[PDB]
From Swiss-Prot, chain A:
The keyword tRNA-binding does not apply. It comes from the Eukaryota. The lineage of its organism: Eukaryota, Metazoa, Chordata, Craniata, Vertebrata. Regulatory light chain of myosin. Does not bind calcium. It comes from Gallus gallus. This is Myosin light polypeptide 6. Residues 4-39, 81-116, 116-148 form the EF-hand domain.
UniProtKB/Swiss-Prot annotation, chain B:
GO terms for molecular function: calcium ion binding; myosin heavy chain binding; myosin II binding; structural constituent of muscle. The chain holds residues 26 to 168 of 172 of the full protein. It comes from Gallus gallus (Chicken). This chain binds calcium. Residues 4-39, 73-108, 109-143 form the EF-hand domain. It comes from the Eukaryota. One of its GO terms (cellular component) is stress fiber. This is Myosin regulatory light chain 2, smooth muscle major isoform. Myosin is a hexamer of 2 heavy chains and 4 light chains. The keyword Repeat applies. GO terms for biological process: myofibril assembly.
Curated annotation (Swiss-Prot), chain C:
Muscle myosin is a hexameric protein that consists of 2 heavy chain subunits (MHC), 2 alkali light chain subunits (MLC) and 2 regulatory light chain subunits (MLC-2). This is Myosin-11. The gene is MYH11. It is found in: Cytoplasm, Myofibril. The rodlike tail sequence is highly repetitive, showing cycles of a 28-residue repeat pattern composed of 4 heptapeptides, characteristic for alpha-helical coiled coils. Limited proteolysis of myosin heavy chain produces 1 light meromyosin (LMM) and 1 heavy meromyosin (HMM). HMM can be further cleaved into 2 globular subfragments (S1) and 1 rod-shaped subfragment (S2).
Amino acid sequence: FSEEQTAEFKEAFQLFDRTGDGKILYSQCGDVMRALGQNPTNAEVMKVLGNPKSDEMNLKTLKFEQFLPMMQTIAKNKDQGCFEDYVEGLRVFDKEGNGTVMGAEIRHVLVTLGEKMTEEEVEQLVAGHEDSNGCINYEELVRMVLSG
Amino acid sequence: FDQSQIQEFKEAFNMIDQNRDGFIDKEDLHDMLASMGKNPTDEYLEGMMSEAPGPINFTMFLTMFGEKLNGTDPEDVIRNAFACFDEEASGFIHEDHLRELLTTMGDRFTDEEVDEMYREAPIDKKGNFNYVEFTRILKHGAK
Amino acid sequence: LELDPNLYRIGQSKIFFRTGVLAHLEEERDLKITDVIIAFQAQCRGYLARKAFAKRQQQLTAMKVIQRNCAAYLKLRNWQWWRLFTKVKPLLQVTRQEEEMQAKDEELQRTKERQQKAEAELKELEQKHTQLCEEKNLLQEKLQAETELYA
C-alpha cells in the first residue's frame, strides 16, 4: 500500500498500545486490522500469526514492521462478501417468507454456528433493529454491518 | 499572546526593571526579588539570563515569555478532552477514575507530580473533582 | 442444475429420483449450510470492533490533550523565568486597581454630566412632544383636505 495510508496505519497501530513499549498483542491483532477497515475471519488472522495457542496469544507481541506484512497478506483475499449471498443465508430462517427473522433465532444462530459470537456481541449487534413483535428485517441488518 | 497580556506584561517589565534606562541587568532582579520576598541564589540570577540569546530588553523578554507559552494547547481543546470521558452531561470527572487516567492509564505521572497537580487544583479533600476551572488554572485566567 | 433425465422422473405431485442423487442435492445440506454460515464472520465482529475503537477514535488527539497540558503546567511552573511572573501579576492589582482608581474618578466627572444631560434632554423632549401633539392633528387635517381638492 502507498506510504500515505501506511503512515495512517502507524498512527492507528500506536493507538492500540495500553502501556508504552509500542507493542500490540497477538490477541489484539485482529481488532487492529478491523480498525483499519478490514473484515477478516478469526482463522484468517490466526494463520498469519502462525497458529498460536490461547495462552501465548496474550504473551506474544507484534511491532508495526512485522504487523504491516500481515495487513498486506489479508488485504488481498481471494473472495469477499456481498449482499446477495448474505441475505440468502438469513432467508432460510425467514419462517413463512415474511422478509423478517425472529430476534431470538438471529441471536441463537450467530452464537451457535461458525465463528461463534458471545451473547453480548449479538445483543449489541441486533438491538433497536427488532420491532414491536421482536422481528428483524435481514435486508437492512446486512446493510448496517456491510456499509458502516 | 493577546493585547491584554501585552499590557500586563509591559507593566510587569516596568516593575522588574528597577533602575530603568531600558534594559534589565542582574542587580535589577536581585534588588526586586529581595523586595518582593526571598531571592533565589546567584546561580539562578545567572541561569535566568542565559535562557535569553541576547540582552534582556522588553522584546527579548517578550519573545522568551511568548516562545515558552507557545508549546501548549488552547483551553477549548482541554474542555473537549475532559468532556470525552463523561457520557452524561454532569461533566465532573470524578477522582479515583481521574486518578487512574493520570497515574496508570496514560503517560503515567509519578507520585511527586500528582501531589503538585492535586495540591494546586483543589481536591478539597471532602469536595470532589471537577472540570473546566482546572482548565482555566492550567492555562491562565486564574493562578 | 443440469440434471440428467435418467436420474429423475416427474410424477403428478412428486419428483422421483435415482439412488444417491437426492443425497448429492444433499451433501450440500450439511456442506452448504455449515459454511454459508460459518460466515457473519467478522462482518459482525468487524463492525463491532471498529465501533468499539471509535468509542475513543474521536478521543484520539483531544485527549492527550490533558496530559501534555498537565506536563507543561509543572515544567512551566517550576522553571525559573515564569516563577517571577507568577507573583508579579497578583501585585498588578494592587497597581491595576490603581489604574482602576484613575479610570473611576475620571468616570465620576462624566457620570454627573450624564445627570445634567438627562434632565435637560428630558425637558427638551417634553417640550417637543407638546409640539408633536400639535403636529399629529394638523398634518392629518391637511392630508384629508388635500385629497378632497384632488377629486
